[PDB]
């Protein structure tokens with residue numbers, strides 16, 4: 059769960075992170091860079107590499123889904139349930155077992171791509187709030203994946 063201060067920062071910065079493409083450029087940057095830093099993850103996702111066009115496509119879906127969890131930050135129960143259902147869907151995805159450990163480096167790639175877009179707006183309070191929101195969102199997905 060997020061405190062009211064954290065929910066406020068997430069909601070405000072999400073408007074700039076979504077920009078004029080519902081965050082699709084952030085999603086492409088996040089996944090391209092994650093696969094370039096961790097080449098082994100391409101096999102998990104079933105991609106040929108960081109330049110496979112499926113990376114842009116999936117990066118956009120991931121970001122749109124984050125925007126849906128942000129719209130429910132006012133009702134944590136709804137956000138958690140929604141993310142658990144996405145997690146359950148992941149039981150049928152990829153070519154390699156999806157491990158909880160993979161989520162941490164993806165979080166780092168996501169926060170760096172958000173900063174690359176919003177610059178100075180990603181201050182101390184935004185980094186703290188987005189780390190806690192990613193922990194909540196990823197943690198709920200993992201609970202569904204492992205159910």
Ligand code: HEM
Pocket residue numbers: 102103104116119120123124144147148151152153156160161164195196199
């Ligand atoms: C390292 C962690 C992850 C891996 C390996 C992974 C893997 C995948 C794969 C292989 C697919 C589907 C491609 C196909 O349809 O065959 C997928 C789809 C998707 N992933 Fe992930 N995923 C991860 C993390 C996440 C996160 C953190 C989110 C959201 C916050 C997310 C949300 C989605 C969504 C929205 C889709 C599209 C399909 C659907 O809505 O069920 N994933 N993921």
